[PDB]
Amino acid sequence: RPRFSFSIAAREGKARTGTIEMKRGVIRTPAFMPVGTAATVKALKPETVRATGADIILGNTYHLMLRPGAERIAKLGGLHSFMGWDRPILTDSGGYQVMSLLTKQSEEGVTFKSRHMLSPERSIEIQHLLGSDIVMAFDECTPYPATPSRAASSMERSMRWAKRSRDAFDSRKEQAENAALFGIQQGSVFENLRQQSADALAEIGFDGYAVGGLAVGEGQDEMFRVLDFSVPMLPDDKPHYLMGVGKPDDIVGAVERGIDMFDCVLPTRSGRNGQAFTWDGPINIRNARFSEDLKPLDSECHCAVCQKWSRAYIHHLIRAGEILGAMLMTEHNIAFYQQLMQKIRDSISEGRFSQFAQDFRARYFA
């Protein structure tokens, strides 16, 4: 396999399906990436993550630099060996934490409170030390809402940081030869700024392009409105990654608008909170109505949890605070997401994705 090759096998409207080939494996698109923030996808062995259908998982520069440390992970042989996942890993750059989990910001980078520093150069270096396959440029996720002036200033800094990220990545031969680098579009909800950002990123040139600055409280209508004009600005022949999205309905609509890659903590995090995804919409397994329900979480789901255990049992586990409850909920939810992505890929391949989206929504929101 090559360092990086994205091939589009089929299209329907703005939707695409295909593959990213990388050294550590093939990624089927549209793709959902389970989030593995602390060098683990919560409550799952890597083999279980793979069994659900995942081709790639997400790590974070910010969290790993704090614990257990980037240099430490490198000394131990890199993130893949450390956690036991041998397939591709995408790492976020820390740019979301620049306004999240305080800080001192400047043109040079960001200092976080022990004191830690991130900059385009340090972020790219950390991602190298982790041995990330898809490296994200170091950016700033503009807060929402933002005024046009502030959104512009923020976006402009991010584009300068994108160029610095590109140069840092390229100067490190082992990284440049074995990993890929994605740029991140900013510009808040403003079409002109999104266009300027896209132009700057395409001029620099990246292996893939993320739509940043969304899933920050704007709501689905606004997010879709921004995607409507933003995705066509990105190079057509490279993957489009919508950061932090999202709920199943968000994913379907984003694919309709040309997005190829997704990640979110929702299936893992909300799973441990009792929320299970089903084709008839989400349920909260903690609800008393499930206490004697012998049916599986979802009637059609092919996952191992739905083959073996009842709603009643999982209800008991989650209510009791049992670790097995988190394990089963998470495996089901991630498997559900992967089944959704598979149905999306198949329907685009067969030229019936529009019908699938309609059918999905009718049942999910019944």
Added chain:
Amino acid sequence: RPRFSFSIAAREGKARTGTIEMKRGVIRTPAFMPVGTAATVKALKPETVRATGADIILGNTYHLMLRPGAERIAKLGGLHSFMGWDRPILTDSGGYQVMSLLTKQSEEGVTFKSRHMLSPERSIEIQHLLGSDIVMAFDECTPYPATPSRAASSMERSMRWAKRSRDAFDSRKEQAENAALFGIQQGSVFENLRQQSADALAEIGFDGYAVGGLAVGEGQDEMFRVLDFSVPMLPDDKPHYLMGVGKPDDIVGAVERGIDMFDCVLPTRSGRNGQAFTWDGPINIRNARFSEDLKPLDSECHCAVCQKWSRAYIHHLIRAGEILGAMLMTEHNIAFYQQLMQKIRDSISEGRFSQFAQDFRARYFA
């Protein structure tokens, strides 16, 4: 397979090795039973529990009657179906909670504070509703220390309760035909009382005999002293079960004294707390000295955890409070216990158990 058949294949001194055949499976003895208090062995799928080598697991009447409820479990098809473990299950009777997790005690039984009641009849009924394979008599675990007078009074009540347990079990045809009933010897640390208890239990007649009233703070020397005279009082041709024991060294010494069955929360509970068992003694994986240790938890252990992950990774997981840390620690510890039991069984079968015990101790306590 029969309802119950215990066969002794080989002996060395007081130690025995053999099998218990029951309808749901064969139990190799000496046996370690992982504890599954809330209808789950903590942090493990039943398939993983089986993969470690476990033939049987333990549930508790007290905990399950409170949550999710005994009648509820029966309505849902019984404990085996509920939790997805199809092999034998032994259930404790609630007698330890009679002084543990307040209460109002009388000759009739015990009322626990919502208000719940246990008696020999109700305990046996609950165990029936759960569908337990090995039912424990309802007893009272005498507190330690106890005066001879109080130990005698307590033991005498337990023997009356043992007869009531026998009659309740026998009056329920489906239970009598498909499950087994074990009596529990009491008498604190007093030889004459232990003898009276053994005589009473043998007169009633049970499928197996537990040594109760130990692992209650007495310490290993005293526990071994009591076992020295107590185990030979029990019928030789039936299994001997030491309730609540214990650490690896406790198990080895108890087998040397004629015990066939063990359970304890130690490998599961202490696993989540960071303690890992090794042939060179226990370690606490939280310790900073393990932060960059690439070796597995134990150098010889055949478990899946030791095949795949480093001390360094597990150290990180436990320090970070990650669920996968609990999963990996628990799987290793239970697998370690099962490997210990296998080495015990093989060594007795080969007439070299005395040498094994000596070799085990020399290395474990080096």
